[PDB]
Symmetry: C5
Subunit: 400 residues, 5 copies
């Protein structure tokens, strides 16, 4: 259109894109900054990197891009590309992207009264501190720091508008609690001028259904299966095999799965604590299995039972568990020979009785250890899980 073309010709006349568009130079320029979050595309615990897809909202009044709509009847808004009009140098301070600016420079809508608008999208990659102490029931606060790079408080009076999450799409792993913001002024060793900034904190809670179903439940079930080593009769040579195979499976599990955790040293993760507790339980189970096998395979001539252990293990533990406690010269020479045979048989029977008593003591120790270990692992797992905060509310929100 003739009017649009003439207005475009007259609008850039004597216009310098480097100049701050203010009628009075001594007065600061007010820029309203906001944010429009859409997706928490990825959060990387190991690298402490937050990746989001957001739209930055900026607005300011331009003193030179004004016209009377009566003289230009058809046009009411005009769009300027990058590098043709002044734009704020608002940057993400704590950006982790290889190129510092991840915004996609788009056009700039302009009022008929000089008011401007700027909505550059972009995949923002910010470095936020990630806490894994209460993993996976942790609540993460990551901060997005936005502020003008080379404009101070006397020049660009940055202002805050509430973040908009109307277009936000739910993430399958993280539940958003809110995105509050704050505006503050900081001094720098470079210069004697304040540099106001707008910081948006992203509070997200991790959904624990997948992790609880894939890590906690299988490991708890395998630990409960490890207790089966104490129900295997000692006569079958499979207790050691079962215990060591369970331990090998679990030690493969921890190293293979719980490696996505960052190599931080701020504190021990809850999952690490619980894996360590399970490893201790399984190792002590193997130790007790070795002790039980040592008691079971005792030589009758190796040594009699000591009085204290004999009396305690055959009276007190039996009472507690209600275990059942088992239990012419030719004739002369031929008689002597058969007497020898029978005496040897009697000695064999006495040795067998001693061995049976040893086996009973071993089985009693085994049952007592099974009960104690089951109680210990139940209480330890319950306490470890309940130690983390927001555990009950997380379960109520996820499983219920």
């Amino acid at each position: 259109g003739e009017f649009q073309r003439k207005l475009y010709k007259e609008l850039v006349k004597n216009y310098n894109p480097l100049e701050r568009p203010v009628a009075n130079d001594s007065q600061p320029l007010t820029v309203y900054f906001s944010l429009s979050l859409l997706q928490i595309m990825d959060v990387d615990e190991k690298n402490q990197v937050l990746t989001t897809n957001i739209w930055l909202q900026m607005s300011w009044t331009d003193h030179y891009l004004q016209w009377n709509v009566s003289e230009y009847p058809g046009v009411k808004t005009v769009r300027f590309p990058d590098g043709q009009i002044w734009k704020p140098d608002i940057l993400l301070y704590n950006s982790a992207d290889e190129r510092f600016d991840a915004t996609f420079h788009t056009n700039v809508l302009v009022n008929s009264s000089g008011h401007c608008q700027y909505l550059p999208p972009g995949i923002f990659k910010s470095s936020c501190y990630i806490d894994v102490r209460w993993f996976p029931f942790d609540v993460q606060h990551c901060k997005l720091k936005f502020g003008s790079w080379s404009y101070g408080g006397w020049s660009l009076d940055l202002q805050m508008q509430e973040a908009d999450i109307s277009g936000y799409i739910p993430n399958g792993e993280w539940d958003l609690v809110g995105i509050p913001g704050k505006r503050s002024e900081r001094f720098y060793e470079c210069c004697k001028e304040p540099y106001p900034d707008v910081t948006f904190t992203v509070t997200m809670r991790r959904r624990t259904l997948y992790y609880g179903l894939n890590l906690l439940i299988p490991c708890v079930l395998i630990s409960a299966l490890a207790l089966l080593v104490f129900l295997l009769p000692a006569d079958s040579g499979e207790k050691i095999s079962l215990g060591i195979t369970v331990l090998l499976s679990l030690t493969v599990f921890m190293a293979l799965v719980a490696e996505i955790m960052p190599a931080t040293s701020d504190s021990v993760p809850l999952i690490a604590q619980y894996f360590a507790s399970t490893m201790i339980i399984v190792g002590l189970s193997v130790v007790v299995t070795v002790i039980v096998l040592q008691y079971h395979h005792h030589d009758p001539d190796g040594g009699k039972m000591p009085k204290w252990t004999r009396v305690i293990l055959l009276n007190w533990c039996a009472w507690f568990l209600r275990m059942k406690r088992p239990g012419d010269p030719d004739l002369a020479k031929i008689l002597e020979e058969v007497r020898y045979i029978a005496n040897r048989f009697r000695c064999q029977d006495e040795s067998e009785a001693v061995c049976s008593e040893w086996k009973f003591a071993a089985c009693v120790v085994d049952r007592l250890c099974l009960m104690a270990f089951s109680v210990f692992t139940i209480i330890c797992t319950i306490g470890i899980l309940m130690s983390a905060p927001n555990f009950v509310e997380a379960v109520s929100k996820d499983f219920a």
Copy 2:
């Protein structure tokens, strides 16, 4: 040519690439937008990222790029590169690429009557919601949202043309069901102007041949082989080894293959449910194996069976399964000694008979458990698989 050079000289005379080419500024500009899908290169279930090779189709009428062919006899079409003529700022709203615009800016052909065409290719990386509840028999709908970034409904009246899949090449993993689309107008908190957009939904079904062959069949086969623990005679100490080895192999299979699923918590995947069912079956098989070994290795002097279990396990289960149920003074002192030997032998024989009865009870329990577990696992696998919709048609298309 002289005519072509003169027309190029006269075409850009007083031409502003920022101006919307409309004869009447108060009227909007009609832009026909379409899409030409070529390949679904990659869909990332874990990353919720879809990657496709597509060509965007845009066409609009330019009021300033017109000429009389009679005055330029040889030329009929001209091409302008990027940044020399006005082009719609149509962008992919839900882009997941590091740079928002993935299009490759190509030349722009022009009619002799001002009509234009624009066919920029590009590797579009859009973020779509990926549902894995019915994996691998899931049907996925992902939306590609296209619309002008800075032009509203009063300026750029975006229209729609049906997507073209004539050049589409098939994927070896996903079967296209179609690419429908819709045009809608929505408001934004920025401005009081509607912004029409065109959204193309991609409906793709996953081909399940590879997954069913490489995950389902091996796991069902190994679960069926785990039932062999109940056909092993208890006299050989290998039931526990077989069971624990099968369980370890299955837990490695799970934690090694079922990891490409995203860590979502919307719902439990079907494959996760079926792996959990298989894990429960194998664990309970190990528990029953320990029970059978406990029954088999019973001390004769430990205690007789309770009459209830004796009668039930020796009558009812035997009848149901048609089990076969097995079964001077020198002479005086020599007499007493052989009497003692024979009495000891008779006691040994009766103890052996009791032990054999215990072994029979253990074997009968084992067989009953084998039958029950086979029925349970068959019905559970069949039900879990048949629960997912479109299962039968997926099989008919893939295997048949």
Copy 3:
């Protein structure tokens, strides 16, 4: 030089880089397109992406870049950079690179008679269909489609010259069979103008030495050592251990190694078929081992051998395999007592006689199944391998 500088000044005068350099605008411009394959950098079966390092070759006559060498004695060729002269917009249609154009824009040589040359290099990433049905003995045909983007048949008459592989550096994995090319005209729904293109098909054969040494041989050898379960005497209980451990090793092998295959569903790959056959063989070997152990550990009082199985297993299989088939009152009651002990011993002897017959039957079944499984695995492996085409020629080229 003065002459060179003057010629450069006069050559750009009134030159428009957007104009097609033709004396008669109605006459199409002839562009000779060729390719210079240098390397096959990488071919990605999983992602269906081919990566090559090639030099495109273009040649066309320019009407405006001509001069008389008599007037410029010293200069005979001139080079222009990108964006200063007209260049064909020849693009790789089926490109899979994040940016569509992977070429590196270099200078353009010019004759003293207007003839031009343009050889841009680049790492080209094309989406070619990869067939893994006969993996690893497959022959892959991948197509590189080149053609002008915005120029039709009435404007840019593309012509094909034979591809040059003179500087081709052989790859250590793939053997180049040839790079034939073809030129065709195809229509588009946009426009009523043909768009000639040049398509180069890359026929490469996979060298199978590495794959046959690292995958086929170890799996065959592991199956051969899994057949050893049928040579272990049943009295020693490690048959189940050996069989299950070999099955575990093989199921780890297949999952860990045969994962570079794409998740395609066009057809079952040969390596997948062979792995499935090996899995079936090992699982059936475990089943037969369980059956053999069940026959070996049979209670003598459990039941006599059925007549049919007894006669056939002790006559027909023995004949076939030529197996060896094994085999005052005081005195009165002392008589009665010794008679009792001897009768018990005789019954005992009959008991181990029956047990030895059972063990012989189990061993005969074991040897028969060993022979059957050996012959079956041999014929299955040979047939599966020889089913794929070009097997013999591939072996003759690689190993011989």
Copy 4:
């Protein structure tokens, strides 16, 4: 503003961005270079790559960008983008990024007296030598070398200001010791001119809580559990199983975990030394277990022990460990026959006694080797861990 626009117009009049802004060309230009470390985002031991978020600080006096504020009442500072004013070509010499320069070119603040300021951020990726001889208790010194690329001592007199870590955020894995630096002049084979540079050395210490908890503790515990093979009674048959399973688990652990060490050959890492010691201990334990099983399973008729091993193993080791040491014609023919039976029984008892003495000797060796191996492993692990320097202080800082 009118004053701002006029000043911008007059400031770039006759200004060449290529010219070094100095009043006297013969005098060098003083540029104060500093650094503002913000985060140690990632260090790559395998790739010898350091990644940090830093802000470079540069300052210099410009003789052409000066004005009298009395003539421009409102403006006091002006900002110039890249490419419009002269900037130092200060580059990171040892950069490991695909593009050599990673700085984000930002605007340039300017005084009212010509003084300048330049604060370009960037994700700096540098190649620093990484020493793993004391892993994970190592202290790393990586050098960042900054200096002008094409300006010498006579032209650009680079000066140094102390690095600022006021805005530094702690890293969860590395504890910063300090960031000292030095300025030096070094010559080049190209040119007879010094090129002063500023080199910042980053001294970081690795926090060892995570590594000590996840690698040292599990491996020490597994090694301690490997000694349980010596407490297993020899009558049971799981000693070899336990030993070989522990060795397999440990080698799987080492292969899967100690792979993020770089493949350097400068020296053997401490973790590699300790893993090798553990592997040697476990292998020698398996050898000792084989020897003990050979001693335990000795045929009585195979031959009596040598007198030397007899006396030593039954006297000296027993004393040291205080182990208990176990321990008408018809009548004639009937006597002869029963005498035969009894003599055979006596010979059997003699052989049994010899075998029991063999078992006692085997158990004595087993206990002695258990004690020796426990002492050896404890001293070896303590010595290896204490060999690394700063071990005590690292433990005190992390665990205490």
Copy 5:
């Protein structure tokens, strides 16, 4: 300064960056090309990609960039950025980066007599053929080809200066042997003009301390521990378990670690050959263990030993190994009964003697095969290691 600004104004007057700066156009331009290798950042055996950080050195005489220093007292050197003065289009022919030109375009210094200098750095990624036949003791020669892209011999007379490695920082993994180069002229099918090039060959040797310590030693030790299967007494059922577990661990080791070799078929790598030999040794050991178990568990009623094997295994091998070779009517009916009992006992003793002889033969076979296998494995490992060239010098340089 005024002089510097005036010289900058006068230097670019009538200047054309496209023009070759030569006084006589017919005469070629002499460009001195060199290289300053700094670091071998990474070499990719699998990808056949060599990554180095180098500085390119170029120098040429410019006819138009000359001035009299008397007229410009202060300035003596000037710097031009990219695109303002003519630069050689020297490119890396065999590049592998996604963009062909990986150099960073820095400033260009100029003499007071027209002599120029150009030092563009960059991370150069070149495709070099990598030979893994003698891995890890291989010596790699990779070629970096540099030459003018669009300038021939008649125009740009390229000259070579020796590569500079003064600034080289030694790599931990690879030892530099030297970087010699050559200059040659090649003809291309495009043009009838020679195109001289400079090719630098990088001769690098791999330091083998890490690989020898982490692959060769563990596998040799594991094979030596697999040889322990022949010292286990056959009475303990653990030979099969030990052998199969070692084979499983080794087959995990190979497929898990020796995967960074490329899938090349030029020749079998030394490490692959050694792994194949170890696998064959372990499999044959398992076969021999199965044979020994078959001999040990022989039914005495199965059949007598063949005379040949009896005599050879009891005489020749025993002599060679010096193995010890073990070794009124009532009275009548009581006589008959006791005679029966004793006759059965004598038959039992004869059977036991036959079984003991079988056990002796099995043990002798076991010891003989142990000796043979130890000798075979030691000779095979020594020979396969010594086969590779530069083995002794690599050992002397690394371990000594």
